[PDB]
Each structure stands twice: as C-alpha cells, then as structure tokens.
Amino acid sequence: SGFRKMAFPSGKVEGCMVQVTCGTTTLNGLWLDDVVYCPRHVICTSEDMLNPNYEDLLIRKSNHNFLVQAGNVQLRVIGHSMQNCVLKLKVDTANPKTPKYKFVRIQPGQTFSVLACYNGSPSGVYQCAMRPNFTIKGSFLNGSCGSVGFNIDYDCVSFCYMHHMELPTGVHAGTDLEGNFYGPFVDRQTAQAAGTDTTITVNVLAWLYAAVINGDRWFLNRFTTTLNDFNLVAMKYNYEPLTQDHVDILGPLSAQTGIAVLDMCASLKELLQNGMNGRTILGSALLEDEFTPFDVVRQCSGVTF
Amino acid sequence: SGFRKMAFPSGKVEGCMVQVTCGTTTLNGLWLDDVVYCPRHVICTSEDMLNPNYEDLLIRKSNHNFLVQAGNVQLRVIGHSMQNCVLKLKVDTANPKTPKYKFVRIQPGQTFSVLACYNGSPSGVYQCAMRPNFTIKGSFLNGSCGSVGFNIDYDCVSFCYMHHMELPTGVHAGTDLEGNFYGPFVDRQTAQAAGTDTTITVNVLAWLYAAVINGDRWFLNRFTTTLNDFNLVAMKYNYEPLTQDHVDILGPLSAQTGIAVLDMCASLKELLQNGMNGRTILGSALLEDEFTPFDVVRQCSGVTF
Ligand SMILES: *[C@@](O)(C(=O)NCc1ccccn1)[C@@H](Cc1ccccc1)NC(=O)[C@H]1CCC(=O)N1Cc1ccccc1
Ligand SMILES: *[C@@](O)(C(=O)NCc1ccccn1)[C@@H](Cc1ccccc1)NC(=O)[C@H]1CCC(=O)N1Cc1ccccc1
Secondary structure, eight states: OOOOBBBBBOHHTTEEOOOOOOOEEEEEEEEEEEEEEEEEEGGGOTGGGSSHHHHHHHTTGGGGEEEEEEEEEEEEEEEEEEEEEEEEEEEOOOOOOOOEEOOOOOOTTTTEEEEEEEEEEEEEEEEEEEEETSOOOOOTTOOOOTEEEEEEETTEEEEEEEEEEEEETTTTTEEEEEEEEEETTTSSOOOOOOOOOOBBBHHHHHHHHHHHHOEEEEEOOOOOOOHHHHHHHHHHTTBBOOHHHHHHHHHHHHHHTTTTTHHHHHHHHHHHHOOOOOOOTTTBBBOOOOHHHHHHHHHHHHHHO | OOOOOOOOOOHHTTTTTEEEEETTTEEEEEEEETEEEEEGGGGOTGGGGSOOOHHHHTTOOGGGEEEEEEEEEEEOOEEEEEEEEEEEESSSSTTOOEEEEEOOOOOOTTTEEEEEEETEEEEEEEEOOOOOOOOOOOOTTTTTTTTEEEEEETTTEEEEEEEEEEEESEEEEEOOOTBSSTTTTOSSSOOOOOOOBOOOOHHHHHHHHHHHHHTHHHHHEEEEEOOOOOOHHHHTTTTTOOOOHHHHHTTTHHHTTTTOOHHHHHHHHHHHHOOOOTTTTTSSSSSSOOOHHHHHHHHHHHHOO
C-alpha cells in the first residue's frame, strides 16, 4: 500500500555523467560508448547567449578546446560535431559503465526521471512530466544544463531529455538526445513565454485508479458520462481532451478495479465542479497529473529493473 | 528554480541489494563488506508470523539454509547471527561495490530516500520521512521487506531504515540496521495501531522558506509571534511543538531570505487559521512537511555526491 512520486533507480545513468568545459563554460555531459553528448551552448559565454551564431562560434573551436572529465580523470577528445542543439564529442575511450540504451522523443503527458547534476556529479533524482506546453517543471540551478531525463525498461535506459534553459517564469526547456527542443524554445537568452499549462487528463484518471487500488474511494460518485460530455467540462477546466486512445490505455486499470473508464470520468467531472471540500486523495489536496497509466501499473505491481 | 521531492542518487545502494531465501520465504538483503543484513522473519512461514518465537525458529536453521543471490550468482554463507530484528549472514565474498557507509538511527521528522526492491532487484526510489508516530508513509508491496532507507554525505551512505511490516492502515514500520524497530512495532502479524500522525512543524517552515526562495510569496503576512503563542496554535492543529533548537536549525534559511523565524511562524499560524483559500504553494494545495531544513538548503544550493 501507499503511493509515491517514484523515480527509476539512477545508478545506470550516474555511471554516464561527465563534466564538459569549453573555455570558461562548464556543464554536464552524457558519456555513452565513445561519445559525450552535451548542450551546444558549452561553446558560449554568458554574453554570447544573448544572440549566438553556433556555426560561427564552432569555427573557433578544435577537439582540444573541449575538456571532458569523468570521475576526476581526463578523456581525450578525437572529434566533435553539432547535431541540432547538442554537441557530440568523440572520445578515445568507450564508457565501461555504458548501459543498454535508446534515444526516444516523448509525447506531452509522458513522465520521466531526472538526474539533476552539477560539474558532472549527481545532486538528486526526481520524477517529472513533459507538460502539454512542452515545458517541464523541474528543480534546476545554474550549472544543471546537460542533466538528463530517462525511463528504464528492465535493463535498457531510454534517454528522452537533456536540460538546456530556464524560462523567466522558472519552468524548464530542453531537447531530446538528437538535440531537438521540445516545443518552440531556442537556446538563446531571449524572453520566451510558455503556452497554457493544461492538466494531463489521462494521468489524473490513472492516479484516481491508483487511489481506488489504495482504498481512497470517497470521490467515487453515482454517475457516468460520455467522452463528448466529459470533454466539454475538461475544456472549461483547462484539462486536455480525452480520446478513445486514452480510454484504451486505461483498460487494465478499469479491469483491475471494475470501474468503467467513463464512470471514472464522471467522478473526475464532479471533483472539477464540486472541488475537494478540504479532503485529500493519496495525501494530495489537488488532482495529480504526473503519473501515467503505465507508471500506476508499474508502482501497483512492483515491476523491477 | 523549481522545487521537487528529490531523492539521493540510488546507484551506491543498488550495488548492495541481494535476494535472501530461507525455505519458501524470499525477501531483500543488504550486502556490505562480507555481511548480508535482512529482516529476521525470512525464517518464518506466513503461519509462523501470527506468533513467532525467533530464537526457537533459528535452532532449526544452518548456514546452508540461507540462499543469498547477488545479480543471479550465489554467495556462500559461512555464519549467521540474529541482532534484534535483523539477521546478519556472513558470506565468503566482500561486496566489491561496497560504498563508504554508516548505520544511523534517525529522529522523527528526519527524511531519507527509499530504494524499493523485490527479489533483490530495484523497482524505484522515493523520498520519505520518519513520522512523529514512528511510521513511514512508503510505497511498498508484498516482497518489499528488506528494502532500505538512506541519506548520503558526499561519498558516504548513512543507512537509517530497513522495511519490515505493513500495518492494517497501510502505513509502514521497520528497523534501523541494528535491527531495532522505530516506535513500538513488532515483527508479528498482530493488529498494531499507529498514534497521532502530527505534522512536522520545522519541516513545514523549511518548505515555506523554499517557497519564498522560489518567488511563491503570497502567504507572507504582516505579523510576528512568540514560540509560546505559535505552539498554542500548533497544538490545536496537530502540529509538533517548535523548540529553540528548531529555530536555530532554520537560521541559514532566515539569513538567506531576511525573514525572521518567528515572522515565518506567524505566516504559518495565519495559513493554519485561514486555510489556503484554493491557492497553492510550490504547486501543493496543502502544507508539505517532508523536507528538512538541510534538504531545502541542499536542493536550493545544488550540493552533489
Ligand atoms: C546552463 O545553461 C544551465 O545551467 N542552464 C539550466 C538552468 C540554469 C538556471 C536555472 C535552471 N536551469 C549554464 C551553462 C553555463 C554558462 C556559463 C558558465 C557556466 C555554465 N548556464 C547557467 O548556469 C546560467 C543560467 C543563468 C545564469 O546566470 N547563468 C550563468 C551563470 C553561471 C555560473 C554562475 C552564475 C551564473
Ligand atoms: C515481507 O515481510 C514484506 O514484504 N513486508 C513488507 C510489506 C508487505 C506488504 C505491503 C507492504 N510492505 C514479506 C516476506 C515474505 C513472506 C512470505 C513469502 C515471501 C515473502 N511478506 C509479505 O510479502 C506478506 C505481507 C502480506 C502478505 O500477504 N504476505 C505474504 C505473501 C507473500 C507473497 C505473495 C503473497 C503474499
């Protein structure tokens, strides 16, 4: 029993973190096989970040201008290339701790673990989600750039996020490991505003199933609804529309609890309209949207890695 | 910016987890140097757990009755002993991944990371606190016994918790690594009721400082108070009394924000009396009490390991 915001065990990723320095700029890199991946703005001064031309700045850089340190030992850089907003530094040594891995680009609503790092050293691990506006609500300080987000399937690490930027509103922007930003964000110190941070409806429903599995049941109501009716309410409350694809993904939790997905939608509709009335669900006074249906099944079934 | 329920990186602990089997009972063990630590009820059947005599059950056990498996390889057991509610299995191989470590017994209100494990394999990592009633609000399923809780100081893992029991109310009980239960709990399948789960006041104050550091300031009020006045309110709302020792521990956060500890107490007093009025602080609709003052300083300063 119990339900926690649970991260993946971080060991396989801890073994990949390095420090990358170019001139006076130091940040984190990810060392997999004989390549180190890091944000391309390692080549920028704070001044350069106001309006950088990355191709032009890279002409002034050679392999020996990139200092890579792994557990206080220097790696030899034998090539470098820019792919979108990341740099790939070829080193002469394969990381002996390289896990089985993939690079994936995740969809809004998908959760992942972050290993927040500074100077190539881990600070902490926490669970995030890709918000519908393609920001993440991380916990990051100066020097966190190059920290990564990931999921694990048994022994395989799927890297989905590298941290680049903090927006003026204190939310976070970054790339996949191919260097493509999530959302419209750019690696420039220019005012960049986020869109509406809508609530991830399928995740809220997953968490209400988690609540029922854990015996928190006060919010279960006498009503059902339809997708179209529910979605009129979702739109009013800045919830993402629910699709039949979302209903399909919730099938296993519906089967485990015997609560039809549209019945749970009707219970959520009443919570949105009535509020909590000072009550809690799984120790929260608000509806939690950073557990996916797969996260709930994983945590409620004790899947290991 | 941002503030997350952040766990310690789990790699150093992942390298210590093993599976222990005695007859038909399998659970998790912690392998440090040439000793494996596990709950003593590994020797019990489900039937035995209703009223076990551990000394009597242990007479029927030899070294070869304890099966220890580390990453799918068997360890040879060359001695065993019971210390309070844990077993210590001496093995013929020192764990090559043994980190620098200490065993500590924590106080109510102190936080730690849990590496939830099943069959000696990590499932996930999350942040907990020792509640004032000496329970923890974990996330644990059947087979989680022997999972551990820990803190890290740079390179040194301080183990503070081993998971044993789930109480009928779905909260968790366990021991330090010397096998002494936190609180009055026993390793027997008997109804055991927890005391009042009071709110950890010094931790709430720490988190309000975190909120101010992050620019969440709406709750800052025009008032101050005294320890005695504040504590009359704390008692009414099932908050732990605040001591001058707590005021002293909050000094660094007071200094960073320029908000006197008793001024922050007065702001908390008004929140308890007025409620949130549907507002949030650091994305929570309730006052969070599982960040210590040290946790807030660590997360807000980017301390690494
Ligand atoms: C890196 O881009 C970074 O950490 N970004 C993510 C981030 C930043 C703040 C909050 C949350 N997330 C990083 C690279 C860098 C640049 C120059 C020197 C060293 C490293 N950039 C920074 O840390 C930025 C961000 C804001 C800022 O003032 N700053 C420069 C800086 C660096 C070191 C000390 C103070 C200020
Ligand atoms: C172990 O004591 C344990 O996991 N306890 C912590 C816990 C349990 C449930 C929820 C949260 N935390 C563990 C040892 C054991 C005993 C027999 C066989 C294998 C392992 N005990 C159990 O898992 C207990 C707890 C409740 C229960 O029904 N059960 C026995 C069991 C074991 C395996 C499958 C089903 C049931």
